[PDB]
Amino acid sequence: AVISKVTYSLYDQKEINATDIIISHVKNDDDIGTVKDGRLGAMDGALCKTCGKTELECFGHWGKVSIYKTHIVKPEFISEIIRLLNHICIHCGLLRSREPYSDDINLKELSGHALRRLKDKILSKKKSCWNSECMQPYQKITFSKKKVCFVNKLDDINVPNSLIYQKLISIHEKFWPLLEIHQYPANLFYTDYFPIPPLIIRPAISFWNELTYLLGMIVKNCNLNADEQVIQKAVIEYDDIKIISNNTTSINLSYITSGKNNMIRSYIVARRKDQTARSVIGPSTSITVNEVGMPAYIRNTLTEKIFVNAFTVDKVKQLLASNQVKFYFNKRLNQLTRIRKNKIHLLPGDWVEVAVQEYTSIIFGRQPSLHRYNVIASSIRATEGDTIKISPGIANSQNADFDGDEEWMILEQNPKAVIEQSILMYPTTLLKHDIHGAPVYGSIQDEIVAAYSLFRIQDLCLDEVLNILGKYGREFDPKGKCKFSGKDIYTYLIGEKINYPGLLKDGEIIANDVDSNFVVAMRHLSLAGLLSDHKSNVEGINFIIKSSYVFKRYLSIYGFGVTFKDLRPNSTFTNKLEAINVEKIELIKEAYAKYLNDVRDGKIVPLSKALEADYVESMLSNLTNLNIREIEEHMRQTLIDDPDNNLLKMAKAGYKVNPTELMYILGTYGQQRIDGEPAETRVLGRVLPYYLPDSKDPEGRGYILNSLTKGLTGSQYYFSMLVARSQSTDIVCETSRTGTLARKIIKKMEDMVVDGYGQVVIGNTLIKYAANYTKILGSVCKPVDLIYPDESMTWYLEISALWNKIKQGFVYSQKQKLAKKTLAPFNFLVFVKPTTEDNAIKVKDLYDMIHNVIDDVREKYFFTVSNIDFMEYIFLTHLNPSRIRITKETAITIFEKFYEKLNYTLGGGTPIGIISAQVLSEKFTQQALSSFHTTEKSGAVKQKLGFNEFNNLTNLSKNKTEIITLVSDDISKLQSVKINFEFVCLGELNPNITLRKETDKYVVDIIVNRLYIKRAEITELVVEYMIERFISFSVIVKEWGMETFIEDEDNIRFTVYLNFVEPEELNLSKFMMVLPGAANKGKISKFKIPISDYTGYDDFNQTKKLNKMTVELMNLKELGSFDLENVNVYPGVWNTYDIFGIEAAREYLCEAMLNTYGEGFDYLYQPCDLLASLLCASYEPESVNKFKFGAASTLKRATFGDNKALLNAALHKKSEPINDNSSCHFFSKVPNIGTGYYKYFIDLGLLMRM
Amino acid sequence: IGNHISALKRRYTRRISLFEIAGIIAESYNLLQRGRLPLVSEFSDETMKQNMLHVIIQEIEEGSCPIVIEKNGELLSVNDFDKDGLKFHLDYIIKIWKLQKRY
Amino acid sequence: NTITEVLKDSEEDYQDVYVCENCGDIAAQIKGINTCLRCSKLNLSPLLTKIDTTHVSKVFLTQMNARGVKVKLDFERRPPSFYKPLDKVDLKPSF
Amino acid sequence: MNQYNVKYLAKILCLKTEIARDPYAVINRNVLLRYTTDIEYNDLVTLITVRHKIDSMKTVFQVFNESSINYTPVDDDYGEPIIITSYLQKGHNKFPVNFLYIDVVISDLFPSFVRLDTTETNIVNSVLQTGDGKKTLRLPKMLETEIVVKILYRPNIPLKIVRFFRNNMVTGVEIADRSVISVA
DNA sequence: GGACTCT
DNA sequence: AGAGTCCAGCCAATGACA
RNA sequence: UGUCAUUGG
Ligand SMILES: [Mg+2]
Ligand SMILES: [Zn+2]
Ligand SMILES: [Zn+2]
Ligand SMILES: [Zn+2]
């Protein structure tokens, strides 16, 4: 009854011939013995002649058509046959070596790679057959896609299938471990019959079959006077047309396993469902985050199930008496009846279906479902209109606006699904984010400024406070006060006397202002997050509901609006900034023109174009920063003049207004960048014809002087529209790539779960010893401040010993960064209360408590295999008596909460892999669609940021260059490699090359400038060596001689005397053409090698100045000739694997995938590690595109997308157990995820006892 | 020492989370919804006058829940888990069920 | 269980479908007797197991059979397991 | 073998000397603070003298190329010649030329690892047991032709599990285990 | 258009 | 070193056309 | 029953 394992194989001929239905005719006056037979299955309007069942009960029966004297090849195993033909001769049948056949080898006992030693010897000898009666040359038989036969390619002759059949059945059974054979090779052919499939895969198409027509074209050639080529072509174009052709849209068998629209991806892991709905969404204030408003047409159409049992039989009889029952399902007769008076007897197991009532859990969601907070299950409320009314508090969880977004609903009224919807998918259960712990729900745009202004309000009456509180003013206690403030309203709203560093003290908010970090969803300073860290998710969800009510009542009483007078009250400041900009940009233009004229008349040597662009870039960036500082001073002066400005109010509250946006409105628009640089010059050295040819105007390259208040001019509007349309094109081009990578990572990581012992496993491989490094849920775990050891601490010795144990890993990013946060196992800071030293717990007893708890936890919960010294370090530094004294019951409360989080939170079956994959995928999709990662160009080669770098990391491509970083304390060792590897050519040194003919010699003078040699950071001897190496090794030069003259301290004349190989005039012109480029040195790359420097960490207290260098390099071989001692070398992923190993490859993949997200995303460390430990779970790094070493089943590979998965499983006779999601969804099995992680039994002892 | 690790892991097996108690409640609710006999003390007709989630929770705390869960190679009743963990999860489940107006 | 009930076919569309444990295809009812035609032609009499899968799963398996891939399912004859009482475990810490 | 890729081998042979005096030691670059090398380079045999700082114990390694091997034991010898091969070969004293292109022990990508004793191996094997019958989880894999397995080698102690001390940005050090699988 | 594999 | 092969986000909605 | 065109989040 429970399917364990599935075995794939090939049908042999005795199972194909095992049929009493012989198909013989193509057309007939009566379809008997034809391919549309009535005994091959029940058609539309006829019972099955084999079984007597109709179309919905007959699953079809097989037939056979007789191919008389032909051996029809199975069309998809052709390549395997081709492989089997590269191992034997065809005139004899023997193998291509004498060592299989001798009586000294004993092929049954050799293990390992000794079986693979002999096979490339078999594929090395292709001269002639080795036996005494066959010395024919070894043919290379190929399947001809042109005409359908098998064709020899030494000479174009058709090799018949009856001879490949004889030579493939001639191979003995005990040579099958050599040639990768697992069954009879006669199962690769149809030797005497062809199977005719049942009608259930080809029903009668009705609108006013293709496979039936293809089988008719097969049976139209099944005659005794018929070639095997025409029958082979009919069989091939019935099975797979792309074997002999290159056309799509033919409905063949391979159409069910062809690409994205194949059968499994479209109809097995996804389907169209009944009891569904879809509608536009709108907000609702009478709907909390735990509810959803359903329109009347949906609840007038959708039905809910009421099961018949001993509890609900009176309700079902009452609903049947009042005609409220819409459907009735009789389980014992197994039939559904629509009630439009009939007779219905209600037995237990039957059900009725009535209209869907309130407080029923509907599963609703928004698309695209990027992460699990898109698809939740909340309670139905009856609302008005035709829109699904959601709360605004869930809107940021679903990336939803009310500007035309649609959401879908599904009703799954199965009792197990009802319980799982009520518990697991309820929005109270999903309050905290499962990676970084911040609340998923909260306040949005207007409620942020309402929260800010409600905190800032003062001197209210009791009636004004109760008007603001509304329905929550029932239990408000005025202690003895008559005048109140907004801080008292917030103290009432929080309702707990908890402390938090920087936010709370005895319930009062000790922060200066309440901003968007306090109330908006997914923020690190949320008050609802602290209230749910204190007690439970119900308290955080209650704070969110009550806070949203009170903020909207503040907006109802006081209002919020931003007018035009708040932005631009007069013309004074904008006129001042306009005059400032038109003064400074003309100063920039005159300075640049003075430099250009000093170059043009010749008083200075010119710069490179990169350095000139950098200088103008710095001047325009200084003008932009001057505009920013003017905008900031105007904001300060406006809020000290008009302190009730609503625009500056929503700027101070933390919603979408900053000095940069106000600079765009009131100041300047800046420099418009395309691909990191300005817009490139087209025809005539310019972009637009509004500027002169080769115009040095920086405003014509994309610098906009105007703002949105003044209005952009035509050229400025061109450059702004160029940036806008470039961003639109880039997000459209990147959306599908992000979706493809997201699906690949989700299918790779989805089978990785937390097992019953707190470990992270996939299949039977242990990935992590402890889930989330704590064996506690990631929503419970708290990133707390890392406190470095100070000698004023109590137990500085123990704290410094723990820091010496765990201090590695806290210095990372090529020693550039020091860790400021660590991972507390839970938010214990809300349970810490300060206490005077007379009432406090004793200091030694607090150490004994911390040490005993950490030792007991390390024994009992981590099984003495995990290092949890970070937990002891956190409890010793954050509960340190040198900075905080606590009571004894405070410490008891903290450690009891610690044991509660270790005991109850994390459970086996937690889908940690698909949660981490969805979080990573949602983040890089958001950063790609939001254009968060701006491209910027620099001199050195740098590691890129963003989605394409993440995809290059997970692709793990081999034959590509890597960025290899060399860090050294001394700069001489980096300079010796930088001189030899950096590309410098003669043409980039800006030379003055002139030649003249002379009797016996062509003489070329190369007058180079010495400042150009110093800007390249080489010497004159380097240039002499470059020219000498090119001329001394070139083919076109017959004789030469070089001399070096001094012309000035500004000029060096390299004089070459030459005679070229005849024809000397063409070789002269070719030499003069290739001379500025081919006289070069170093590895050719577009990036230079500048030696950077920074401050690197040895520890928190000791640093050192370090010199850095980056080289694009394929291998590591050419570095092996240098004195690279005491030099840190950071290669790419494959050189790190080939030198240091698989663990260093895992570490590089972790930190490199983390670095693509940018600054401020350290919480993505724990997902990325979980991805990297999946890519390096075998002995070699494996990509996300293929399954090479990981044990993946055939249905997993077919659901991932692999069209030849079941064919390769049938060739190798694979027998695989059904333990993965893709294999459980195929056979309608419950996956081993979550509640399905456990098997459930029923103990019938207590029922039989009574 | 391998026996000591086996004892520590057998003690770790008694932890209960939301997935296990949700699966136990879902199995007993699906069996009671299709017509199995409620195994509560004080079996009457009055017990068919209350709702079924009260019967499921009463079966859980009375120690007569028929559902046996197979975890880590062991067979566990709902009373073989940690009693404080069962209470901790059932308090939350009863709270959110009272918000849903079904308990 | 929610995603299982979503992805599987509806409970109203249930019928007793039997599969052959030897050859892997759907058994037939001739005149009330569940038979396998391929095995009764091959002079066998193998086990027939009732399966509850989706219709698209059976269409996919029959089409893969039409391509030549024989798909044979194996079933769990699990040993009968017995509940035994367990000792008391208290996970509260010791202070 | 040149005059540059013998200093990196000397840093490797400090770790091999530390393993030869204690098979259950923790190998990282900090071990290099307890040793001192002296290199006598020649294109036929290079003699590397590794000296323990506090115990004054000397160990002389004789480094050869793969072609020309003229090995007779000197006093205080390691007991086996160190051979610089052209490709990655099976053997604890056969280091390929790609391992010595850069300085590998001082790198940040050099791991921290131990060989587990019988107590820790029994604890790991009983942790990996799934509880259900005789079923067992597997550790992730690592090839025997790796510089960690070459450093950790002992002649009559078979190396099956290597414990790694990973750098961890949020917890400091993390414990992982790899299982060493066979090659050729 | 672009990455992996066989030739 | 060069061709073959497969891959290119999800969920929609109308109308015309074969 | 599928293509093409246009559009939405
Ligand atoms: Mg929208
Ligand atoms: Zn039939
Ligand atoms: Zn021959
Ligand atoms: Zn059969």
Side-chain angles (χ1 to χ4, degrees), chain A residues 28-84:
Chain A
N28 208 278
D29 280 307
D30 206 341
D31 286 332
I32 290 293
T34 54
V35 71
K36 314 169 61 62
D37 211 329
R39 41 185 185 153
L40 287 189
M43 322 186 264
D44 203 39
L47 303 175
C48 184
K49 286 170 191 163
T50 316
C51 51
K53 308 292 165 291
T54 179
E55 197 170 16
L56 277 76
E57 291 179 352
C58 174
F59 281 90
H61 313 275
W62 281 86
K64 52 183 196 185
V65 60
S66 177
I67 39 169
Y68 291 95
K69 286 181 293 295
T70 57
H71 297 254
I72 297 310
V73 178
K74 284 171 169 167
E76 68 269 15
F77 310 114
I78 287 182
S79 190
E80 167 80 44
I81 288 173
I82 287 176
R83 187 192 71 86
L84 287 172

Side-chain angles (χ1 to χ4, degrees), chain A residues 764 766 769 808 822 1130 1178, chain D residues 108 138 166 170 172 177-178:
Chain A
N764 62 329
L766 177 131
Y769 270 129
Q808 68 169 1
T822 179
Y1130 306 90
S1178 176
Chain D
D108 282 350
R138 304 305 161 195
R166 315 167 144 177
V170 307
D177 293 324
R178 307 304 283 239

